[PDB]
Symmetry: D2
Subunit: 432 residues, 4 copies
């Protein structure tokens, strides 16, 4: 038997790439799950204390709220370790959270007096689903989106820098009408930013409604309380999530599919970018900074990890929203992997950022391919001939002068070179 | 060699289920692709005719517009057959569309005079991408969304009808706090309608910008025309699509991934429904209308086709937005399958609708399971005991009377039966 | 409503590519399913006639066997059309096959006398599973494997032809130790032929054992007959398939997953080849026969169709072998698509063959890249230095002469050029 | 920042399920990769020492082989830690292995004398591909296959125990001809054992041929050595793997797809079993040992993990065998996940074994459903009537006596009960 460390970890998420994924440890690990379960339970008790229709839980003093707030906003590793020890006796992970809170409540008579209202009328999935939404919110807002925007801005900076650099296009791998290198990078920024907006806009849904979605227990004890209004206030007001009014025992997980589908679309664009840049490197269009070749390993590591991320995202999106009758428990183990596709994504984003920072233009190779391709000028000549109802630089001057076009058109056509035939690529690139 | 018919078709889309998919023949077949290519080319010529900066194409008479409008809005099978014959000579499908329009333009001297402006400055993908967006728009709006809404409304009608029918819940397959059958159906309506809104809201993106995205040819012939403003007017104003300002030779297909991801999420909810209903049938909770068992074949046929649809949607979403450099042509053959996942979806939707229409409540079996499960009343008794700081119908009356709870609580608790312990399921179901 | 033809077909299997998939119409269409159902039923009746333990069915005369053999080995479209008409009354597809055979048996008093033994003791899935295995056998052996072997042999011919052509290798897109173009093609042949052997070796499993796998009905009527021995004789001896002794109502479909996984592996190698050849074309290493560029469209069409084929193969392999309890009917509709992944595969194989036939070496471009890369000779110099314990052609001659290596080694090292540094690539390529 | 432990690990492979996956730490972690790289390098040096055509490396003394054998067969964590420290200076993981071996060789003048032949003529992928094959071999043979066989034998034991227990079948969820519970379990054993044989039979392929597959460096230094024969001897003879004679820089990874496809097929059968058992539990056919319901959580945890395993297996099988030209490096990061699908598989296998061990027959519920379904006897009555050319127990006795069948048939038919109508299910189950 070998002790666990990054050297011995089976998955490279916590192994080879442990340093790239460490920002997810407070969020998606069992520690993070425990952290958010504690937060939800604490806030639920505070909600009952604030609710005048639940007189059995009175408003808390500053002293009692200080203790509760410390558990919900300054959670310590020792609390999670204690919950793991408690779970040895409860054989149930959410019940262990309840008992930790009961142990903490025993420190103050004011909290001990209402210890039986911890988890009041709740089912385990009331705590779990809100925890998952809060985990996804923190992962999305504090880790994933910042890296996504860093990629977009890094590519934008290069697109503007290279906006005026003419470059031969390749369609089906072969010469095509010219563009600029900055324009080809700007195209990627625009696609990535569409998906960033979609990722940021996904509603993160939560519920709190008891065993099967119908507030049965709540209404047996407190028939006069509007539990649906309380649930919406708790979820939207206290927790800052979006309310899901119709559920079974579980929140149905459609929004997780929505979020993972959006991240996967961002990742697909980044795969396309990683492969195109690998190709530009193979052509010698980029070189090493400070010609020394640039090794494309960072783009390749990114590409490999994005494919794994997307395979996990696709599976979770396809499988999570199917649950037998009022639920089966297959989702419990699967939801322990909410951070794994995110981990492979952020490994890839860091790698793509590292690769982008190594890129320096090799203008000589770019110009070499463009000047060797005067065939790209057949298209503008044909289009000008077509307007007026009608290869080498030397041949172009004699051909154009013999055309039945206005002399002003011949003057501009005769000045045409492959590097000049870029349309409005540069203006489009500059304003990305 | 065997002649093609629905009996000999290799794919069941045009074979066994030809009658279920016939509404897609005007849209996603090669006929539909040709139809929309013709429409785009006609509208492009009309756009140039309306554009004062393109004086070489003057506004058309009513007579000339009548001919053009007939091709763009009353397209005939004979025109598509002629395009297929022309393609034998052009060896190029978009070029065959151009030649058909040139043949039609030859009928009127006014149109013949501008025949060289058909396809002016366009690349094949300018026509193809707009065609694909228009195909997806018609398929989504006229075929897919109506069926999706029919499913939601059919389930809503049953949910309201059955809103008051108490039913034992099953979590991990085993008895749980009761609900109503109508509530369990209402949950599905709510999920489906979220995805319907997402499907309807996807932007269908188009571009028209020449060979590589930079208007190179347009600007060589007409340097003074604002071609980007013209493209947005054509796409948003004339065609009613959403403009994509940054592309390569192809429109990058991210929006197709967005649309297919949304349809797939709807389909996942419907798989979940098909399987749950199969389970309710297995329990005998539904019977045949007009007890005669109901055969669940329609739900099973739906479930099978939804899985195929989603596999195709996932592949197209994952693969289409990756294209080498300024494009490779792998997307051309793949985009001929835009209607195939939609076809399997609508086969499944029709089957689910047929199955829903066969369902009739078997109240005896539902009540039998509920009355045989007094264990579900432990939860409300525990919760009431918990509020006040504290199985059979006969045992419940003696147990409750011995509790230290207010007599008003004992009166309500003693009246508890499994069929009565439904929380607010009925009110939630009725307002779906 | 539009009449069905290849122009109006929704799926390109029977649409744009109808001419490429027509060889599957006798096999995987509803016609093919019907054809094989008839074959199985006829052979089953003949098996009972030959079985001395079933005296109620006596051996058939030559006249009666002539009629039966015509249905089982010279099946006509009119019989399938009649079965479709009969199905309008039976509302059951296998029952319609039974009634067609009863109608044919009515033509001869000898067959009419035993018409009630058509389908004797069978369940629908006894007929269906054997039909599916026979469909897969004919599709694999008569269509798929011949095309797979054609690809392997076409690449082999080019590998041997080009075995001596030195070529710069590219690892991570950048120059690496040289190989020969023929060697790089030979590598593909070897991989493809491994998968061909695996495809050909899959056992195609069948069963015939009544409603749930236990011969219940057979044993009630004929308790003294060894029905398991009869089933193995029918399946292995009469039909030439492999016997599956343990099933439920359905044959469990694991072997279909085995077969589809093997075809998918062949297809993955072919995708890799299609993309590598697209790359060699982009480098100008191949040109058009009879330099004129070769358009790589055939490789791109192949690549696109292989991805679709593999997505369908993966879904059917993953979903078919899961069936609720003694079976659910979701497999029935899915198995109508057995030929669809095969269809996309053979579309791709034909396209790859067409592309291979267009390839002609462009020796000038290949030699140009090799001579411009003397850096590849650092590896052999280092290795020779390492053996004995120790860039340009002019610099290499002076560097080698100063080394403390045997003079015989310096003579061979000084003769080193990039095009000569190919190891044993040519000998490996020639013997593929 | 949080220190890594099982509590803080992002992936549940090394987190919640660390205790279930610990047997993979010596194999698939970075430690395991390093361990096998060291083994391959040591054995390669020993191969050169044994090769008379490489006189520069003489046979090793017992003392020198003792040191080398200790590194290759008694590898210590401290060696892997040292390699990680060395990698800080080399910036290259395989080069760090080379330097560790050079440091160890410095301990003995005999080994120091040939330190420059460590890694002689090798490329990094020569070491990596053999390491991967050896990792897969140990994972398959020492961890995966033993658990797979444990599942098969555990189900076999229950199948034989329950071989005589009659049970109503359910097809499309509804009553069907009876079977025995042991027969339904035996069906699973047979399917699982077919896949076990396939998993065990996959060839694990290796190569050792330098930078691009052509032995370029080897032949420059030792033109007279048969390096292909040496490679086959090393791989098949010294390492016990299967030789792959045609590769590029990488071994192409087809065999990894073969292995992962086979494991995935086993896993699909186990998903089917997990779901069927969940269903039998929901029906009350199994209860808790020592009626107390059995909670199906172990089957649900298994089912969830099998789906994740298969998604990873499918992705690696589909992506690994595609590598640009003579290779791209996307496979390097992906191959760090070789153990992750295996980890989710063994988590699921342990869970399924735990669930199987909790199952105890509830004969009362099984008999209750069977006796309430006399409709299953229509099939045997119809079949007997059909042989001779022709519901309740009381109605069956009067109906059978009125039939024109031999009196011996009526005596056996009149004795028919649903629980007796099991065909040969029991004999098939007993011999599994």
């Amino acid at each position: 038997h070998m002790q666990l460390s990054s050297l011995t970890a089976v998955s490279p998420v916590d192994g080879r790439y442990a340093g790239k994924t460490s920002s997810l440890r407070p969020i998606f690990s069992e520690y993070g799950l425990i952290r958010f379960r504690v937060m939800v339970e604490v806030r639920w008790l505070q909600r009952l204390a604030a609710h005048a229709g639940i007189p059995e839980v009175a408003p808390f003093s500053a002293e009692a709220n200080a203790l509760l707030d410390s558990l919900a906003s300054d959670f310590q590793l020792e609390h999670a370790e204690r919950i793991k020890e408690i779970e040895r006796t409860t054989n149930h992970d959410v019940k262990a959270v309840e008992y930790l809170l009961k142990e903490q409540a025993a420190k103050l008579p004011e909290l001990a007096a209402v210890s039986e209202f911890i988890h009041f009328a709740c089912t385990s999935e009331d705590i779990n689903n809100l925890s998952h939404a809060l985990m996804l919110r923190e992962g999305r807002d504090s880790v994933l989106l910042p890296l996504m925007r860093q990629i977009a801005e890094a590519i934008r900076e290069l697109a503007v820098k290279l906006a005026d650099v003419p470059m031969l296009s390749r369609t089906h791998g072969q010469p095509a009408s010219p563009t600029t290198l900055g324009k080809e990078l700007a195209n990627v920024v625009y696609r990535l930013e569409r998906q960033i907006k979609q990722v940021a806009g996904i509603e993160l849904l939560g519920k709190i409604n008891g065993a099967v979605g119908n507030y049965n227990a709540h209404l047996s004890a407190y028939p006069e309380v509007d539990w649906e209004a309380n649930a919406r206030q708790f979820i939207e007001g206290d927790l800052g999530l979006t309310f899901n009014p119709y559920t079974t025992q579980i929140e149905p997980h459609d929004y997780i599919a929505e979020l993972f589908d959006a991240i996967a679309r961002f990742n697909t664009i980044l795969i396309d970018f990683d492969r195109d840049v690998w190709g530009y490197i193979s052509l010698g269009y980029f070189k090493q900074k400070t010609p020394h070749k640039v090794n494309p390993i960072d783009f390749e590591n990114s590409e490999g990890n994005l494919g794994i991320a997307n395979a996990l995202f696709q599976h979770l999106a396809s499988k999570l929203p199917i649950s037998r009758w009022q639920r089966d428990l297959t989702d419990s183990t699967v939801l322990r992997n909410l951070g794994v596709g995110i981990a492979h994504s952020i490994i890839a984003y860091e790698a793509s950022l590292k690769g982008i920072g190594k890129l320096e233009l090799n203008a000589q190779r770019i110009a070499e391919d463009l000047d060797a391709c005067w065939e790209v000028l057949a298209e503008p000549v044909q289009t000008v001939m077509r307007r007026y109802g009608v290869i080498s630089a030397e041949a172009l001057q004699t051909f154009i002068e013999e055309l039945a076009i206005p002399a002003e058109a011949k003057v501009e056509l005769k000045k045409l070179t492959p590097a000049g035939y870029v349309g409005n690529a540069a203006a489009q690139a500059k304003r990305i």
